[PDB]
Amino acid sequence: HQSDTHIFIIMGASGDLAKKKIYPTIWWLFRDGLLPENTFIVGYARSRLTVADIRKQSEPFFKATPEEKLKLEDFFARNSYVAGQYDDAASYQRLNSHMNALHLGSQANRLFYLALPPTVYEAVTKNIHESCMSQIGWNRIIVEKPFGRDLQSSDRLSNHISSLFREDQIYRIDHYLGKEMVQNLMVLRFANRIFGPIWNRDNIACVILTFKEPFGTEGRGGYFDEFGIIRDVMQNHLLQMLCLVAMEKPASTNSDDVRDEKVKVLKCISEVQANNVVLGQYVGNPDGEGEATKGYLDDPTVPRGSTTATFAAVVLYVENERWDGVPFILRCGKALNERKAEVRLQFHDVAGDIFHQQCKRNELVIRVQPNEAVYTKMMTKKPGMFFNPEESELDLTLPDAYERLILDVFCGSQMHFVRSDELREAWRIFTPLLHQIELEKPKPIPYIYGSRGPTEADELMKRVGFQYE
Amino acid sequence: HQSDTHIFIIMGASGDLAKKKIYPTIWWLFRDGLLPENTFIVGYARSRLTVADIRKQSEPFFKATPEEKLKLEDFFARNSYVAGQYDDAASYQRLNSHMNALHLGSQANRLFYLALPPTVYEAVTKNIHESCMSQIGWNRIIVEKPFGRDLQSSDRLSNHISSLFREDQIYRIDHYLGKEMVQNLMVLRFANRIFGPIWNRDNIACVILTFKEPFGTEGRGGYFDEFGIIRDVMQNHLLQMLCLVAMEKPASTNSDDVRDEKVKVLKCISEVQANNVVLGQYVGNPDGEGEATKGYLDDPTVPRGSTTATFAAVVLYVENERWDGVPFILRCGKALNERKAEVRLQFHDVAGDIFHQQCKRNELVIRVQPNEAVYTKMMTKKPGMFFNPEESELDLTLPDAYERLILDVFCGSQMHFVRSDELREAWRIFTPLLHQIELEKPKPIPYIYGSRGPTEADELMKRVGFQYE
């Protein structure tokens, strides 16, 4: 994918999401030439702007340097902007004409990016499929989360998008996915007989899937209330972790095979009520800071009396022979004590204790971020004149995660993007939970800003059987 | 064992073995005070000497400094010497009287050290049992290798020693044993479900037990001939490695249980034929600088036309449910390429190769010496944009081995010393082969001083199933 021209159409160029994360990401990719050499960027938005205005409002987040001002002005040499509405065939045809009025725009692999408001996904995708299809190269679409709110809405959206594009063209992206050691966990799991056969019900006691954040929801508090942590990260990213941990032997490790194993695991998950769900929400930190002094409900853009949770702890199980009866854990949140993303595989104790109850349950952490590291906290003898062992952390282990994911979109690798049927089954899993949520509006348990999360989650892992040192 | 007085009776104080290795070892242990505070040394030999003569003849090897000259003279302040023959009750009673004429010599735990020549073991042990027994404290002895030559001689000698002392008062020592990395193998085997359940026939492909020595037998070539590498290191040290690796369901880590499981494993191995044997012997190096210019047969003290081997590779296959049908490899020798003592636990390949045959058989090396270190050469993905793994050496990891074994003899820990019945069964499984050896005088295959050993050993590893990459 380094020869044929590509177009990275950023719908919503004036959008805050674009200007804050997408344009700086493609700048990072373009200063180092990770995108293909003949890469075009064609923004699009309602507001009538220009390339100079884009420069003026986006340079500070690009944070370029006088050393590579030349590379910067080459980066804007590939840029362009188109003005139009989101539901009008006239402006859509104008966008198509502008795209075709480039270096083989029709031949260019139009890699659409939907950074536009969530309320229009249906209409924008319908217009894109009707008018903005190039019949030469692949036309992938990047749909940003979330993909509906409950089972019925998600099914309708998925069926519409399936009737428009095929799954080879739909790319459901997840920003938080590391893709660096979510990829290394696969190698560790498959290329070992040390971890291979003990990847079953008898040996691995449980799996803890954690994704914490150090910052709250300052400013953009009006986007999280309608959605909730479950639909934001818990149902997409934590299920991605759970599926890539619980998947059976793919036997060909391709994207389709791994997603099919994900579908098999998910189809092997029974219904989940509130009995395996815990919710939590944060409030003002008494030891305040520049942004910690105000809680979630202190954000003026958040509607008063909103029961949207920012912490979700759920336990899943897989009803197949390899994973029969063995538990899995999902934990996440925002504004927690410290940024982290780990997958702790706690193994069973060896049947028959001989070190006088000193045997600690062997672990295997995959700390996706920050300071990426994989380590097995196995236990070995301490040097000296003794015999007793000590639990020791044994380390076993570069574009950023988001630009790596965009590069994977360019390459065509759909390993880490949820499938239509995978999403359908995933929503089927939590349909009772989501219906209860939208019916009764459950009240999450308050927790302190920058804490470790509600104690009910740790109690949930304890009920599962997870052992905390 | 820091209050009651101890005596380290070095029979053969004028002996070369004593003056070269035992007295410097107890000096190393005494400058740091690892012997009990009220420890005594009472040598003994045919030739008449004195403490000053011992000082003059043994000072240079202590490699001490004038700063610790005070500690050295304190170390010789507790030394002693008794003159007498090895087979005379009169001199034995003189020795006993000298012992009783000390600071509670009768109460002292006489820790005898049979460093005296092998040809007299029967008579010396009989006299020691008859006369030199203190009836107050424990009276252990350290019996040095080899423990007989064939099945019948070994059985007679072991039965006599059993009739004299119980198995609590016998220590079949093995200098080469590390006592540290062997000690960590036990922990790595027991305190993990990472290695525990896969410690069976289906997962561990084979085990390689290796022990090499860069220096030959210059000068002392008249000692190795009558014994052979099998009876020197293979049948003691390499079988100790095999028992520690293979023993089933050890139970309490105590000496009794570990040695019982050693007995069970050795009862679960059948007779060794000539078909599982490789022998080798070394010759001089044209390119060598020091001793390498002369080979084993170049030693004037070696009888001409001697077929004693210095390299022996024999594989065992323990026949019980946990280890049914597995290869266990023994490799050893002298004058090899470089010092080493490793246990390479090569596991099976995962059934179903999905990384396009990039999967290398997972290993686990336990380097006993030099530079003790455990590293699992497991395979993980190297950082990059490709979904490919790399075989990476992942490290897992203080007197020396002889000091720690002497301390073990002082403490009473008999986990590292071969048992009477264990020795009987090892000689029973080597009986047909050893009788054929003594009958036909097999000719070992020549190999180069300082090489890696005869190629037939690697052929043996390949035949049993060991994979070399």
From Swiss-Prot, chains A, B:
Consequence when changing E130K: In CNSHA1; Ilesha; class III
Active site positions, chain numbering: H237
Free-text tissue specificity from the UniProt record: Isoform Long is found in lymphoblasts, granulocytes and sperm.
Gene Ontology terms, MF aspect: D-glucose binding; glucose-6-phosphate dehydrogenase activity; identical protein binding; NADP binding; protein homodimerization activity
Effect of R156W: In CNSHA1; Vancouver; class I
Keyword Protein transport annotated: no
Protein keywords: Acetylation, Carbohydrate metabolism, Cytoplasm, Disease variant, Glucose metabolism, Hereditary hemolytic anemia, Hydroxylation, Membrane, NADP, Oxidoreductase, Phosphoprotein
Keyword Phosphoprotein set for record: yes
PTM statement from Swiss-Prot or TrEMBL: Acetylated by ELP3 at Lys-377; acetylation inhibits its homodimerization and enzyme activity. Deacetylated by SIRT2 at Lys-377; deacetylation stimulates its enzyme activity.
Effect of V265M: In CNSHA1; Viangchan/Jammu; class II
Impact reported for K360Q: Impairs dimerization and reduces catalytic activity
Membrane topology: Peripheral membrane protein
Outcome, altering R419C: In CNSHA1; Chinese-II/Maewo/Union; class II; <1% activity
Any one of the GO CC terms: cytosol
Reactions catalysed, as given in the entry: D-glucose 6-phosphate + NADP(+) = 6-phospho-D-glucono-1,5-lactone + NADPH + H(+)
Effect on the protein of changing R419H: In CNSHA1; Andalus; class I
Effect of Y44H: In CNSHA1; Namoru; 4% activity
Binding site for NADP(+) 1: G12, A13, S14, G15, D16, L17, A18, K19, R46, Y121, K145
Documented EC number(s): 1.1.1.49
Linked pathology: Anemia, congenital, non-spherocytic hemolytic, 1: An X-linked disease characterized by G6PD deficiency, acute hemolytic anemia, fatigue, back pain, and jaundice. In most patients, the disease is triggered by an exogenous agent, such as some drugs, food, or infection. Increased unconjugated bilirubin, lactate dehydrogenase, and reticulocytosis are markers of the disorder. Although G6PD deficiency can be life-threatening, most patients are asymptomatic throughout their life.
Something else known: Binds two molecules of NADP. The first one is a cosubstrate (bound to the N-terminal domain), the second is bound to the C-terminal domain and functions as a structural element.
Name listed for the protein in its UniProt record: Glucose-6-phosphate 1-dehydrogenase
Organism: Homo sapiens (Human)
Gene name in the database record: G6PD
